Amino acid sequence: AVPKRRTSKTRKNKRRTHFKISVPGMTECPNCGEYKLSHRVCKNCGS
Amino acid sequence: NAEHNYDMNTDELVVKEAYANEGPTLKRFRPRAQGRASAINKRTSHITIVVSDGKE
Amino acid sequence: EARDILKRPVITEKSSEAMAEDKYTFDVDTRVNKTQVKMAVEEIFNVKVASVNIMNYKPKKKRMGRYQGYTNKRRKAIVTLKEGSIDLF
Amino acid sequence: RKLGRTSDQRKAMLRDLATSLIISERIETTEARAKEVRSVVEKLITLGKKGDLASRRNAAKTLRNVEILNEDETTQTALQKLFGEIAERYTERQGGYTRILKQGPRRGDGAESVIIELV
Amino acid sequence: VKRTYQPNKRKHSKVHGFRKRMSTKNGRKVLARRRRKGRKVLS
RNA sequence: AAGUGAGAAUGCCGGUGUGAGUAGCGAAAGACGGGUGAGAAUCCCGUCCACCGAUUGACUAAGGUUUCCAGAGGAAGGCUCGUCCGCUCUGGGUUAGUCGGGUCCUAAGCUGAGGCCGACAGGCGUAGGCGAUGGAUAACAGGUUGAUAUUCCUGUACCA
RNA sequence: UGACCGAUAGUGAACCAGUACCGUGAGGGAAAGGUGAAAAGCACCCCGGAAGGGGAGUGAAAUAGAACCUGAAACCGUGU
């Protein structure tokens, strides 16, 4: 129930290979000079 | 900073480097069970960002 | 004596409302009684006082601005007449 | 069907939302809550179309018996407005048709904010 | 549960104090030690 | 001429790691509208709903010792958030002849001039002195403040 | 006066010391020195609610800006 040995800087950086965030949809507004969320609306993004 | 000091373009700009160094951390304490107490750390960051134009 | 028993008067928003009911508040010494102040305000101001009320004040803590310290204790006394006028402002 | 709290608690909350969406036109809440109050509000508008005594008694089993309208400057008690104004304004095949508009997430947590207006 | 050390003003000035330590010779030696050390609080 | 050479003593002290973005985040049921602001699930007002219900109610005592009221905040602080605060900074707030005590009186005990006993230190004891948790002593109806009320004010009585 | 110490040394204490704190009590008992020659301690403009930056200015020096002489390892990052 307790780590027998300590992890290195190579085995610790290998586990953080999938630990990341994905990019958003960024549905560019038709004509308003803003940015609306995918299938959403904003006070600046007209479309 | 590159619009009043250098007065360059804005549409033709690209972020060159972008990192974050560590800073001084504060030490706190949390009372556990059976009288023993643990420790808590409050680390800080030194976010830095430089903007270029695709040329030196 | 009858001069060192009276320090300074209290000028706040509560003492200003007591002027309409003829009740002046003063800061006396922390060793006088409720009879020595009746013979010190009836001679310095020459006015026949009616009754007198006193109250003790404990010392406060301090402030982070300077360093850990303490405050001096004070003794308030509300003297009220019924024919005399004011002697301060 | 979806959940959230306990059987009784859920029921109570649902009734509150429905009554609050009948005397305020448009309101803004969460996604799941807006996708569950769009089936208990449309059924109430269907009972208001009939305009019979039986329906009126069945419409008082959900609508809260309070919330006296203050914007009408009178003694309107929800039901009257629903069986007089809301009912006398809809003639579509979707009875109490309602639309929902999605928006950005909240700051507190990550719940997706949404708006449900009457149509 | 009921713990120890029950606060009591009168009792605190009875078992200890300056009038109780200045009543015996054994308790008068503890007032000299603290004074020598430089303690800012004596009983 | 020496405090002269460090890799190990479950060695002493300080700083930073690994476990890991993992375990945990410790009493009631909340929902929406309006307001404030650079920023609101969390602050302010409103309506509905619910919980305690011989108590999570109201008041004496012990104990703690400004945490109480108002105005302004940069963080630190608060197991999230914060424009909020039992947190920081200014300036304020506790009124008694009758209310609790002190003062009168004594109980258990604790100290005692002469007086016994003891290498010394110091023990014990007679009148006396001290010592309440008990005895003896005199208030009510109302009106008012951002913070005090049998105490301030108004009427009216009682004790010395 | 010294083939004595020079901030983990020398007094427990070079500074806020018998002080923070710990215990019913007798008692136990820390950590913490250094900008520059002189505050000349960043006037002014730009981004931000502020904090903090980027120019400019003071200086021999600003990678000397009060986390203020020198700045070593463990540890954490970006480019190649």
Side-chain angles (χ1 to χ4, degrees), chain A residues 1-31 33 35-41 46, chain B residues 1-6 10 13-16 18-21 23-56, chain C residues 1-2 4-20 22-61 63-84, chain D residues 1-15 17-64 69-92 95-96 98-111 113-116 118-119, chain E:
Chain A
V2 291
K4 189 119 191 116
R5 322 247 348 108
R6 77 176 216 192
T7 72
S8 42
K9 306 195 232 123
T10 167
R11 199 199 270 289
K12 159 191 88 153
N13 282 245
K14 265 182 200 250
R15 206 189 28 236
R16 297 168 182 179
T17 183
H18 288 123
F19 191 78
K20 64 203 301 211
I21 46 194
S22 30
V23 197
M26 298 154 322
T27 52
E28 296 236 88
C29 187
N31 264 152
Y35 234 145
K36 113 189 155 206
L37 294 105
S38 291
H39 286 78
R40 267 149 196 77
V41 81
Chain B
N1 270 3
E3 199 69 1
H4 169 305
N5 285 40
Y6 294 63
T10 80
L13 238 39
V14 169
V15 37
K16 212 163 139 74
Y19 44 98
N21 303 322
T25 89
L26 313 168
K27 275 114 206 352
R28 296 306 167 228
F29 289 107
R30 182 107 239 140
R32 297 311 282 261
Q34 261 120 359
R36 83 154 237 157
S38 293
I40 301 292
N41 305 117
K42 313 297 196 113
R43 314 127 161 316
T44 47
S45 320
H46 286 185
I47 47 218
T48 302
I49 173 170
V50 305
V51 147
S52 182
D53 66 7
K55 189 41 206 109
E56 272 286 84
Chain C
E1 288 243 307
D4 29 11
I5 97 149
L6 250 62
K7 294 143 80 149
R8 337 148 278 277
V10 310
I11 315 290
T12 74
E13 289 215 74
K14 180 133 174 182
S15 44
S16 63
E17 172 281 354
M19 300 279 205
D22 175 11
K23 283 170 180 317
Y24 315 94
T25 327
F26 294 81
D27 210 12
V28 306
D29 210 78
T30 64
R31 267 178 316 112
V32 319
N33 63 22
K34 203 149 63 141
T35 313
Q36 299 181 42
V37 291
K38 198 274 218 182
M39 100 180 169
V41 140
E42 176 193 46
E43 169 265 347
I44 288 207
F45 293 175
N46 264 265
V47 37
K48 282 178 317 163
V49 294
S51 96
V52 158
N53 285 345
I54 48 188
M55 76 195 44
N56 269 299
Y57 257 74
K58 283 206 240 138
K60 282 224 266 235
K61 230 29 225 313
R63 249 136 187 160
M64 224 11 272
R66 319 285 300 151
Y67 249 62
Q68 301 65 3
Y70 258 96
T71 323
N72 333 356
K73 38 190 222 175
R74 337 135 50 172
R75 187 122 185 255
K76 230 156 49 127
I78 293 126
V79 53
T80 166
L81 12 137
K82 41 150 224 305
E83 54 87 35
Chain D
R1 25 217 221 44
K2 310 179 144 107
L3 305 174
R5 341 185 156 295
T6 203
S7 182
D8 35 292
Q9 279 164 17
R10 166 182 345 119
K11 171 160 180 195
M13 177 174 109
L14 274 191
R15 283 173 57 164
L17 279 172
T19 308
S20 274
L21 157 73
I22 278 264
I23 76 173
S24 185
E25 293 327 335
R26 27 160 300 143
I27 59 149
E28 56 179 316
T29 180
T30 67
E31 192 51 45
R33 288 189 213 142
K35 278 200 178 162
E36 279 303 275
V37 88
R38 106 193 140 168
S39 319
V40 43
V41 152
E42 292 214 11
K43 282 204 218 320
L44 271 182
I45 303 211
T46 276
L47 276 186
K49 264 165 137 185
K50 312 190 63 175
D52 75 55
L53 202 68
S55 306
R56 183 183 295 262
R57 280 193 142 144
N58 264 272
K61 267 207 233 112
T62 312
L63 259 188
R64 288 267 163 227
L69 260 309
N70 294 332
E71 294 308 7
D72 199 288
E73 322 296 336
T74 29
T75 184
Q76 272 207 311
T77 83
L79 210 67
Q80 310 188 342
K81 140 171 219 175
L82 151 82
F83 260 93
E85 198 4 86
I86 293 174
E88 202 166 17
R89 156 214 292 218
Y90 287 152
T91 177
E92 320 180 309
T98 182
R99 84 171 78 240
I100 323 180
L101 307 94
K102 309 195 150 220
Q103 274 163 351
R106 284 205 304 212
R107 184 172 169 290
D109 0 89
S113 259
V114 94
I115 278 195
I116 175 148
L118 269 191
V119 144
Chain E
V1 337
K2 175 188 213 196
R3 306 297 208 176
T4 88
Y5 171 50
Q6 299 308 346
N8 193 345
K9 279 189 201 85
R10 158 144 192 181
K11 181 106 172 44
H12 185 38
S13 277
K14 230 48 185 216
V15 48
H16 322 138
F18 176 108
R19 293 257 319 160
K20 167 102 224 92
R21 295 235 178 275
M22 283 273 331
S23 76
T24 68
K25 175 177 319 262
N26 257 330
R28 207 145 47 212
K29 301 199 15 133
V30 323
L31 269 174
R33 291 204 296 255
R34 299 202 130 232
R35 207 179 257 125
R36 195 223 289 119
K37 193 144 142 123
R39 289 261 181 210
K40 161 223 225 180
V41 309
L42 268 62
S43 90

